[PDB]
Amino acid sequence: WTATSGSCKGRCFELQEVGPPDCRCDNLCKSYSSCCHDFDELCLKTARGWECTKDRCGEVRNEENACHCSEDCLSRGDCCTNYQVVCKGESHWVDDDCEEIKVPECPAGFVRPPLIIFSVDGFRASYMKKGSKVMPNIEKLRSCGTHAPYMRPVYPTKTFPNLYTLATGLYPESHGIVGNSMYDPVFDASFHLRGREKFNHRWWGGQPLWITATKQGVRAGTFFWSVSIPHERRILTILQWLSLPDNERPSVYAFYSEQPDFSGHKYGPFGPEMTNPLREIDKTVGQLMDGLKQLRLHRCVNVIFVGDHGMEDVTCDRTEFLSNYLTNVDDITLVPGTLGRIRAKSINNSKYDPKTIIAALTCKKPDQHFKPYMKQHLPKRLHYANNRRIEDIHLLVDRRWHVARKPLDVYKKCFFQGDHGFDNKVNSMQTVFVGYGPTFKYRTKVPPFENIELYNVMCDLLGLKPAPNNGTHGSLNHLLRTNTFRPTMPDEVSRPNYPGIMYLQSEFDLGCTCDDKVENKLEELNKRLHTKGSTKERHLLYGRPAVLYRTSYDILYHTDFESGYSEIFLMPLWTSYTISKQAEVSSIPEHLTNCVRPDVRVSPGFSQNCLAYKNDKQMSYGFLFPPYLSSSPEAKYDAFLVTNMVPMYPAFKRVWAYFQRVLVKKYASERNGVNVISGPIFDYNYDGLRDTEDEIKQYVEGSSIPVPTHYYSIITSCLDFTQPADKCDGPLSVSSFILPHRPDNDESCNSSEDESKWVEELMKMHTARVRDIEHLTGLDFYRKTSRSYSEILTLKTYLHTYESEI
Ligand SMILES: *[C@@H]1O[C@H](CO)[C@@H](O[C@@H]2O[C@H](CO)[C@@H](O[C@@H]3O[C@H](CO[C@H]4O[C@H](CO)[C@@H](O)[C@H](O[C@H]5O[C@H](CO)[C@@H](O)[C@H](O)[C@@H]5O[C@H]5O[C@H](CO)[C@@H](O)[C@H](O)[C@@H]5O)[C@@H]4O)[C@@H](O)[C@H](O[C@H]4O[C@H](CO)[C@@H](O)[C@H](O)[C@@H]4O[C@H]4O[C@H](CO)[C@@H](O)[C@H](O)[C@@H]4O)[C@@H]3O)[C@H](O)[C@H]2NC(C)=O)[C@H](O)[C@H]1NC(C)=O
Ligand SMILES: O=C(NCC1(O)CCN(C(=O)OCc2ccc(OC(F)(F)F)cc2)CC1)c1ccc2[nH]nnc2c1
Ligand SMILES: [Ca+2]
Ligand SMILES: [Cl-]
Ligand SMILES: [K+]
Ligand code: NA
Numbered sequence: 001w002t003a004t005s006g007s008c009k010g011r012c013f014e015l016q017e018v019g020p021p022d023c024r025c026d027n028l029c030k031s032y033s034s035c036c037h038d039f040d041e042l043c044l045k046t047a048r049g050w051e052c053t054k055d056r057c058g059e060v061r062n063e064e065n066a067c068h069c070s071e072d073c074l075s076r077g078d079c080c081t082n083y084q085v086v087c088k089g090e091s092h093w094v095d096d097d098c099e100e101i102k103v104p105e106c107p108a109g110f111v112r113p114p115l116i117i118f119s120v121d122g123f124r125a126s127y128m129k130k131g132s133k134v135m136p137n138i139e140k141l142r143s144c145g146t147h148a149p150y151m152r153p154v155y156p157t158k159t160f161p162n163l164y165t166l167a168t169g170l171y172p173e174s175h176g177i178v179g180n181s182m183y184d185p186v187f188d189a190s191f192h193l194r195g196r197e198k199f200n201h202r203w204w205g206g207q208p209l210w211i212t213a214t215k216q217g218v219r220a221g222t223f224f225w226s227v228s229i230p231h232e233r234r235i236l237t238i239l240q241w242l243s244l245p246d247n248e249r250p251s252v253y254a255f256y257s258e259q260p261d262f263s264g265h266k267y268g269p270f271g272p273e274m275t276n277p278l279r280e281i282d283k284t285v286g287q288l289m290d291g292l293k294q295l296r297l298h299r300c301v302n303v304i305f306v307g308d309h310g311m312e313d314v315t316c317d318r319t320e321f322l323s324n325y326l327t328n329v330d331d332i333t334l335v336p337g338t339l340g341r342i343r344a345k346s347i348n349n350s351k352y353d354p355k356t357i358i359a360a361l362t363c364k365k366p367d368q369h370f371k372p373y374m375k376q377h378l379p380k381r382l383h384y385a386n387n388r389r390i391e392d393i394h395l396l397v398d399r400r401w402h403v404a405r406k407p408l409d410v411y412k413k414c415f416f417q418g419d420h421g422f423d424n425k426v427n428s429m430q431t432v433f434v435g436y437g438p439t440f441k442y443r444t445k446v447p448p449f450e451n452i453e454l455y456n457v458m459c460d461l462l463g464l465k466p467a468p469n470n471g472t473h474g475s476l477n478h479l480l481r482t483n484t485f486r487p488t489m490p491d492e493v494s495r496p497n498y499p500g501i502m503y504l505q506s507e508f509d510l511g512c513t514c515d516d517k518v519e520n521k522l523e524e525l526n527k528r529l530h531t532k533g534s535t536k537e538r539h540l541l542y543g544r545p546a547v548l549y550r551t552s553y554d555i556l557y558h559t560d561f562e563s564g565y566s567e568i569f570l571m572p573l574w575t576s577y578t579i580s581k582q583a584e585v586s587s588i589p590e591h592l593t594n595c596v597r598p599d600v601r602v603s604p605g606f607s608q609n610c611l612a613y614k615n616d617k618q619m620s621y622g623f624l625f626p627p628y629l630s631s632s633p634e635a636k637y638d639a640f641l642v643t644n645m646v647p648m649y650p651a652f653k654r655v656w657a658y659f660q661r662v663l664v665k666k667y668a669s670e671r672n673g674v675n676v677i678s679g680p681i682f683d684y685n686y687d688g689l690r691d692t693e694d695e696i697k698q699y700v701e702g703s704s705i706p707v708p709t710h711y712y713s714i715i716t717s718c719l720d721f722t723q724p725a726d727k728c729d730g731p732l733s734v735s736s737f738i739l740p741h742r743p744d745n746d747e748s749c750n751s752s753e754d755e756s757k758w759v760e761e762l763m764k765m766h767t768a769r770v771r772d773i774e775h776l777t778g779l780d781f782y783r784k785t786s787r788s789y790s791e792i793l794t795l796k797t798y799l800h801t802y803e804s805e806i
């Protein structure tokens with residue numbers, strides 16, 4: 001109930017929220033059906049439009065006007081945004097040359113530069129270049145401020161998950177808004193775009209910027225705008241708030257535009273109808289900047305121009321129907337469109353089986369435009385699994401397509417020509433970032449970055465301590481003139497042991513054999529040096545990784561590679577090796593095919609054993625440093641140590657072997673040497689975080705050898721590829737992956753073919769940031785470089801996407 005009998009007189013767009021049933025006057029009352037009777041009359045005036053004309057100058061203040069051209073309007077904070085241009089011979093902000101803003105130039109009584117977030121829905125990254133002719137104001141912000149060529153949204157590339165990720169710095173799996181539509185089985189409640197449940201606070205996890213600000217004493221404008229409030233009124237309201245007394249005035253503001261997304265859905269991303277909505281957004285930016293100029297705030301306020309996601313060409317005829325695959329199509333509920341999420345229609349159906357549903361959806365048609373996954377098998381870069389609202393069965397839909405349950409869902413629910421929601425690496429989904437103000441840099445381009453990083457920067461901009469989030473604080477310091485956050489490297493928690501030769505061959509009973517009984521202080525003093533780390537500077541280029549949790553591990557040196565061997569998990573946590581451009585690939589000699597050798601530095605009780613692999617009919621083994629890349633026949637024996645071995649499904653060894661035998665040398669050839677760090681990942685509860693030992697759900701049969709869910713590699717070289725990876729004097733270049741360690745290759749529909757037709761495509765799909773690997777391993781990489789820590793943080797957040805040029 002609301003007793004809408006009160007008045008909005010003097011309360012228009014009040015900043016505190018009064019509780020029911022007293023009537024509301026804030027920018028959300030419309031959405032609550034709770035505005036006072038006179039809200040429209042007093043608060044949404046429209047008389048005379050939004051611009052001053054020549055004949056309005058000096059007018060007698062008529063309070064019925066939407067905005068004013070009377071002489072007192074500046075001090076009342078309520079002029080039309082073009083007032084000084086029309087009436088006082090001033091120029092529009094867009095017409096002024098830009099001049100570097102070296103220091104904030106603020107009116108007295110401003111404690112900090114205000115932050116305005118100008119967020120635009122569905123603003124595709126390529127609009128910046130492609131619409132540049134019709135967007136002068138946006139183009140000026142972009143060229144004069146700090147801009148990236150694009151910003152990466154989160155998956156799914158829908159509106160609510162992305163706006164709430166911007167506000168919180170959290171992955172949707174952690175913030176809770178995992179789609180525009182959701183079912184929460186614990187609540188037994190459903191969230192939708194239309195309706196009242198979405199207003200219920202229980203959906204919204206983490207701590208958004210306006211709450212962070214408020215709790216730390218920084219006042220916030222109200223971020224959310226009712227759809228019926230026109231853009232011009234939103235701008236005038238922000239500008240009015242900026243004229244409030246010091247003690248009442250917010251320091252942070254948001255404006256939101258439903259465009260260009262609204263029109264993009266109807267006309268496609270580049271429909272000729274898209275020019276007008278872009279002009280219109282630009283005009284709104286012009287109104288804000290002119291308004292700021294009038295208030296002498298245009299060299300005081302930091303302005304962020306940011307989108308939530310892009311827009312792709314999608315039409316009704318590009319829909320895949322689950323009814324063409326499933327016999328039991330009515331026993332499932334599908335969340336449909338540019339992604340799919342499947343659950344059982346009824347929990348009382350014990351004949352529901354996800355395994356049969358996935359098999360029915362797997363590689364069933366030659367050109368199939370979606371791929372099913374159990375959510376824990378999605379590419380880890382998507383971080384889309386750890387939430388009860390994310391259904392176990394997921395469909396990754398090809399760009400330009402939809403999935404639907406049955407044809408009747410499409411024609412009785414072409415309308416649309418654009419949509420979004422696809423994999424967040426897709427070019428058409430990328431969106432925009434521009435920062436302009438005293439705290440941002442001048443005329444600076446920065447590399448693409450992920451929208452999860454911005455919350456930290458928005459906190460930096462307002463002098464706030466960010467709540468715990470998924471950004472990497474410091475990774476975006478290169479965007480800022482000042483206010484940078486100078487992070488320290490985390491402290492190593494576990495220091496390594498450096499074992500020497502401690503065990504005789506006969507102490508081992510591992511069931512392993514090797515044909516290595518083939519025999520000189522020339523070569524024998526030399527091999528001693530190699531086991532003490534004589535070549536360590538070659539294979540460990542950036543310092544050893546730090547272990548950030550309590551564990552027991554050994555550093556093991558070899559001619560061709562160095563490892564950090566976990567006595568707890570019985571395998572390396574990491575194996576580091578450098579492959580120069582000149583390196584040669586050899587094969588495993590016939591006699592050495594099944595050779596496994598005990599490691600005399602490491603006790604039998606802390607070693608794997610070959611018998612377990614013999615007994616386990618499902619599990620084979622691979623090596624972390626590949627025998628193929630050994631520097632010499634004698635060095636090759638090192639690669640067969642039991643301490644270099646890891647458990648691998650035969651199906652996965654097809655992937656791993658091709659990577660090691662073909663791709664590493666290809667990368668070294670292309671990048672002028674590479675340093676590789678590889679190892680196991682255990683993430684059985686799919687939370688993106690390293691498992692403890694008591695979380696492991698699978699072991700090699702009859703043993704304590706834990707089975708990785710994934711294997712990673714980090715491949716580093718010199719950004720300037722004229723320098724070899726092992727003699728690099730400047731910035732680095734990295735690509736990484738986290739491959740799912742799966743007993744089949746069902747994911748790759750082309751896997752019956754030669755590895756050269758499908759393995760690299762798989763790897764590309766499972767590209768990852770070094771940071772993703774850090775979370776999954778509890779390791780910290782790049783501890784010893786000549787680079788600044790902030791630059792290394794940026795490197796650790798890099799994702800090699802394999803998309804073409806934007
Ligand atoms: C991205 O960044 C984020 C943020 O930093 C990372 O997420 C954090 O990770 C932490 C480790 O997983 C986690 O810490 C836990 O907190 C528990 C208390 O959490 C509540 O309070 C916080 C603080 O206000 C709040 O944020 C939480 O909100 C969650 O839950 C509600 C809904 O229930 C949502 O509104 C919200 O969206 C959020 O949900 C997300 O997180 C939860 C996990 O908390 C997931 O289940 C959801 O799917 C969703 O993703 C909470 O309101 C605390 O209880 C935990 O402590 C347990 O474990 C420790 C081990 O150290 C042990 O000492 C304790 O005894 C305890 O164990 C007991 O409980 C067990 C489980 O019930 C039980 O099995 C045992 O037997 C014991 O009884 C733990 O410390 C932190 O909450 C989240 N924060 C957020 C916002 O998600 C995230 O990891 C990053 N991602 C990556 C890849 O890096
Ligand atoms: O327009 C849509 N929905 C309408 C809204 O609900 C209206 C109210 N609103 C708002 O006022 O924005 C608040 C905000 C702004 C910035 C921000 O970013 C931050 F925090 F970083 F500043 C954080 C929060 C949110 C969007 C919509 C769009 C595209 C679609 N495609 N398919 N369906 C769709 C539905
Ligand atoms: Ca885990
Ligand atoms: Cl959704
Ligand atoms: K086996
Ligand atoms: Na296959």
Ligand SMILES: [Zn+2]
Binds near residue numbers: 265
């Ligand atoms: Zn949309």
